[PDB]
Amino acid sequence: ALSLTADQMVSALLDAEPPILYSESMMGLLTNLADRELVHMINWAKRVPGFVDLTLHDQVHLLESAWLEILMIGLVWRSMEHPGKLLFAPNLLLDRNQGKSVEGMVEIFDMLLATSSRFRMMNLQGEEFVCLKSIILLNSGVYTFSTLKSLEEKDHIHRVLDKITDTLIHLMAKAGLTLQQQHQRLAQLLLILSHIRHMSNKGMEHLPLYDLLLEMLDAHR
Amino acid sequence: ALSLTADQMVSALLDAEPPILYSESMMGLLTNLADRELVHMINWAKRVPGFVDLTLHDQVHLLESAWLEILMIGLVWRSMEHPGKLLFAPNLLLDRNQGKSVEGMVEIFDMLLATSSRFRMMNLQGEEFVCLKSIILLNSGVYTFSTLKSLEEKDHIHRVLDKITDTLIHLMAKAGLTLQQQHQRLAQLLLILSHIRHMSNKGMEHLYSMPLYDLLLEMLDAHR
Ligand SMILES: Oc1ccc2c(c1)CCN(c1ccccc1)[C@@H]2c1ccc(N2CCN3CCCC[C@H]3C2)cc1
Ligand SMILES: Oc1ccc2c(c1)CCN(c1ccccc1)[C@@H]2c1ccc(N2CCN3CCCC[C@H]3C2)cc1
DSSP states (O other): OOSSOHHHHHHHHHHTOOOOOOOOOHHHHHHHHHHHHHHHHHHHHTTSTTGGGSOHHHHHHHHHHHHHHHHHHHHHHHTTTSTTEEEEETTEEEEGGGOSSSSSHHHHHHHHHHHHHHHHHHTOOHHHHHHHHHHHHHHTTGGGOOOHHHHHHHHHHHHHHHHHHHHHHHHHHHTTOOHHHHHHHHHHHHHHHHHHHHHHHHHHHHOOHHHHHHHHHSOOO | OOSOOHHHHHHHHHHTOOOOOOOOOHHHHHHHHHHHHHHHHHHHHHTSTTSTTSOHHHHHHHHHHHHHHHHHHHHHHHHTTOTTOEEEETTEEEOHHHHTTSTTHHHHHHHHHHHHHHHHHHTOOHHHHHHHHHHHHHHTTTTOOOOHHHHHHHHHHHHHHHHHHHHHHHHHHHTTOOHHHHHHHHHHHHHHHHHHHHHHHHHHHHHTTOOHHHHHHHHHHHTO
């Protein structure tokens, strides 16, 4: 995981991508969809290089912090060449007007559209996207875990995150961006993660979970 | 503003730094302190390179999204040398015992400590801190503004952000960090901003249940 080339990390991440799921009241549909996405997110996480070095208990706490942001970054990714619209599933596409029954998601809806438009303008690549999704998984919960060794289990998370930063920069050098453009784009991308956090907390207010993730993360062949 | 050097950007920000204010019910003392800090943050915000270039309403929008993250990162910065404690004021230092008696503080107290101790482990420099703050100001509100004119204002904000990113990097080079170390530290800092947005969202949920656009509108006009 520390030992991977920047290229094997990208390849490991591309090839771990979850499938795009189909749709099956509006909030019923979205809830059914998300709940099925969750199962696949657990499988993706276990293949994020470095995640499975962690203790089971730290894997749960990280996924518990991060799961909504992960569904959102997904959604925004597949909505990208779909201006004005959210592609929840290839058979459930909603325009701005169609959050006109689900009160509340109206703030969120516009926030996701804006995130999607931003990825569009930046010309966000899939290799970059899987790097950013991996950072959310490692980061969202890292500041919310302190015996001494405890802090050593945190340090490894930060080693892996540095390793994903090296990877994003490597992909940027490869495409021939200057050292200055490299730094600027990396920052633009990391700053968008502030906004995805904001969206998840507003989403959480509008929406135990530990057991559910713990049972799912623990699977018998 | 886009003409600035890294060093001149730094000098502008350092010069614009608000003073550290004193405390005069614990929630009562904190409200009164943050309310007086808010006047100084307008003064500071007006001297962030690129901020006065924006329309009045864009300026209000940004301060509306950011002000509480700006109070928290200031808090966390002056708290760096006080493990277990939050230095709200030089005469108002709270530890965990006081911290559980303050409503709204109960979720965020440990998040604030963690941020402080993280800045403490990383040895954040004052030149780095003033850059992260300006970034918060220009970034927090930038994806919750769709006209052609709005597209041009967001373009500006994003160009000003690229020049603060440049300044952060220049500073790390100067301090002798390798290129790798430079990117790595850039990301670690920008990732902590994500946690500062989390704590603001949490803190905000409490403060809103205890009109801001119009108060900051009148404060930016009063600065005239
Ligand atoms: O890919 C998706 C799928 C669904 C959603 C999003 C992306 C992004 C936006 N989101 C949302 C969040 C809050 C309010 C309105 C919409 C829905 C979504 C809907 C429901 C859920 N939940 C419902 C309950 N269930 C509880 C068990 C754990 C998972 C959780 C998922 C998650 C996301
Ligand atoms: O530098 C400071 C000063 C005070 C505070 C912080 C940093 C960081 C955390 N914070 C807080 C947050 C939630 C619950 C309890 C305390 C207090 C703080 C207290 C009050 C306010 N408010 C009170 C009401 N007032 C309403 C008018 C607009 C400004 C707003 C400021 C802001 C921060």
